[model samples]
Target: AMKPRIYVKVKPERLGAVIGPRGEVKAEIMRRTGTVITVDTENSMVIVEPEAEGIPPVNLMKAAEVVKAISLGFPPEKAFRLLEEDQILVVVDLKQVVGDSQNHLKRIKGRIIGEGGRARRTIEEMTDTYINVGEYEVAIIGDYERAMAAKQAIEMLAEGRMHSTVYRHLERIMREIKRRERLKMWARE
Candidate 1:
């Protein structure tokens, strides 16, 4: 059994964009792709498993293309398959934000935490991904699927894309997560 492997490294600045509102984009990517992926924000690198033993090797280039589309303003589900089995990795490591150290990192940190603590908290609640804005960099950690979704949403938002439009799709992701969480609890019982 031969499986295909591809590595994706998101720009450190694009981390938030890849991860959309309430992790909608990331979750959708996982559900659509049907692959297991992990994101490492510390390295700004994504490790994708396109194929594996007992698993079919999906067209990763296609998947990446879909993601590229989403980042360009298309909805997450619209970017990838809505009912397929394949997932992509999208790590958002902050180490790429290299610069001369002189406490200048404060600007970056401040950027993540918007005025009056709105943007940062809003993102945290929406994505369910832990966001840490250090003096040097900002890190976003979460599942491969969710990470991808978040990334797309962030990009759209950055481009002045309509959150109202993007969020219309995000509700689906939130409902699915809640449903899965409920099922997990039920199985525990």
Candidate 2:
């Protein structure tokens, strides 16, 4: 039986981050997920191959996303969070929102990042997730529901919504999420 493989396109500048210093990062990812990763620097692509038949398809996907997360400016430690069960990555394209204007993109990135990174750090702490404010994208790592909340929050900020308002919205969403989960647990009883 052939093992599954996944291919991911990473930015050329970020190839080194995915591979890490001396290939330690790639090796660590492979060891954790039972997948082999090869970086094609020429085309900025990463090839992820499962090492054994028993490795799940989801694991390969996770590995691919990890590479993506790192490429999106997340540290390898933070990127590895995708390996957790139910964890996911959500990327928002700043190009869509900011168009082709370098100044517009820079402004939006600053808004998401906030003064001295306070805003970005606040959102991460509030959502219990990791956020990367990259050049032309924002990437988040968390379980499904929280990651979506984080994404919504980032989009709100990008659209010029007040930071305070975004924080309020996040609080409301997180509260609702907790309440719903509680109800579900009770229902299962």
Candidate 3:
């Protein structure tokens, strides 16, 4: 069966913000959703699932809006702009004992986003979650289980763990992608 394809766009300046540190955030999203998602940084385009089966039945409009809200400083409802919005995934996670105050949480979230969005993009490219660290918590609305792992991974980073440790964990998570798995299976055959 052919899968549906959704094109995601974000501003050039916001590209890194849409992605996360080392691409981990986006990797997680594709894994959980079982979608073939790719980001074209040169064009600021994100193409998700040419096959419809790969597309999640969830509210895609809401997902797009969420990405917009993070990429730009738009309000919750007003973030659904077709122009600047990109083909991206969300990485929402389960609630954990995060920072005590919303202010503090937002500050930490900003840290995840990084200056000019370096950390955030790196995370998305590596994890594949397309996460946006908001005021109270980092909202990742992608593949459900993958989102959780991405969040926990970020929590570890927030706690100042080693980069190599996170890298290994994220690689393991991304290997779950269908194409990668198939390649591994074929290799053994």
Candidate 4:
């Protein structure tokens, strides 16, 4: 069966980051997924095609997701988290729920980021998720259980909350998450 070509739109300013020094990052992604990624520089699009042999079609999509993660303003290290089996990507589009007023956008973006990134950093630390708020979209990278909790907390902030109120709740949620997930790991061992 022929696999569909995966297409991802990359921000032009981020081209250097995705390609890396001497095309290192691009080549590494190809090496890992057995994919051939052609960058359409003029259009700022990445086309990911799977190799003919020894690669699943899914690898093509995986590579595309990684590319999309980078485009969403995550650094390469955090974007690579998608390569792990337990890790996944999640997004919350503020524009999807809220109107497209620049004023509204500015206010909400500031709300999630808080003063000096304290709010966003706190959430990331609690859940160990890498988050990038770009283009009215909050992109999150974490294992399923953790990302879900992180997403929930972010949604609360997006809807609006006091810092300490959100903080205390998040701490409680993470505590329960760690306790249960640890026990689950014990059983598997």
| Winner by lDDT | 2
Worst 10 residues of 3 by lDDT: 76-85
Model 4: per-residue Cα lDDT over 70-132, one tens digit each: 888888777887877778899988886567788887888888999999899999999999999
- Candidate 4, after superposition: displacement of residue 81 in Å? 1.7
Estimate TM-scores for all models: 0.35, 0.93, 0.42, 0.89
* lDDT score, candidate 3, position 64: 45
- Please report the TM-score between candidate 2 and the true structure: 0.93
Worst 10 residues of 2 by lDDT: 1-10
Model 4: which residue pairs collide? none
- Model 4: residues with Cα > 4 Å off, grouped in runs: none
**Candidate 2 residue spans exceeding 4 A from truth:** 1-3, 186-189
Backbone clash total, candidate 1? 28
lDDT for position 48 in model 3: 61
Cα deviation in Å at residue 117, candidate 1?
Answer: 4.6
Scored by Cα lDDT, where does model 2 land? Answer: 0.91
lDDT of 1 by residue, 1-189 (tens): 346655567657555555567756655565566655456679865555554454445545555544543434344544453233443334332334435644434544444455775555656567665444443434444555465555554444433445565555555776677688799999999
**Superposed model 3: Cα runs more than 4 Å off:** 1-95, 102-107, 178-189
